[PDB]
Design a protein around this ligand. Structure first.
Ligand SMILES: NC(=[NH2+])NCCC[C@H](N)C(=O)O
Ligand SMILES: CC(C)C[C@H](N)C(=O)O
Length: 101
């Protein structure tokens, strides 16, 4: 609008269940930190393997990572988030948000 940017925010929570001999099929990248509607989290999905576990569940390149296995990771550093994802083994529940600007 004339007073500022408008967005659509689409929240997606998915359960990823993978096999031992595969990844979840995404690459995390990291963008004090205060979240904003346009910029909701430090970590986001730089890429998602088409047809991989994450892709099939509905995750997409550009999604911002909000939660991992019930823990909010909006303000959490890259290495820490990766370690939290690995703690779950072959199971990962994540919440992401897709921002259209
Ligand atoms: N496009 C890929 N899935 N590459 C391999 C996964 C790499 C990613 N950093 C995880 O771990
Ligand atoms: C967050 C990362 C550890 C995910 C990893 N690249 C995978 O595809 O399983």
């Amino acid at each position: 609008g004339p007073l500022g940017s408008d967005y659509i925010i689409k929240e997606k929570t998915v359960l990823l269940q993978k096999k031992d001999s595969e990844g979840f099929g995404f690459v995390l990248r990291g963008a004090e930190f205060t979240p904003t509607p346009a910029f909701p989290a430090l970590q986001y999905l730089e890429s998602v393997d088409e047809g991989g576990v994450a892709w099939r569940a509905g995750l997409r390149m550009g999604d911002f990572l909000i939660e991992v296995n019930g823990q909010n990771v909006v303000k959490v550093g890259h290495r820490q988030v990766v370690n939290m994802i690995r703690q779950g083994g072959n199971t990962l529940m994540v919440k992401v948000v897709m921002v259209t600007r």
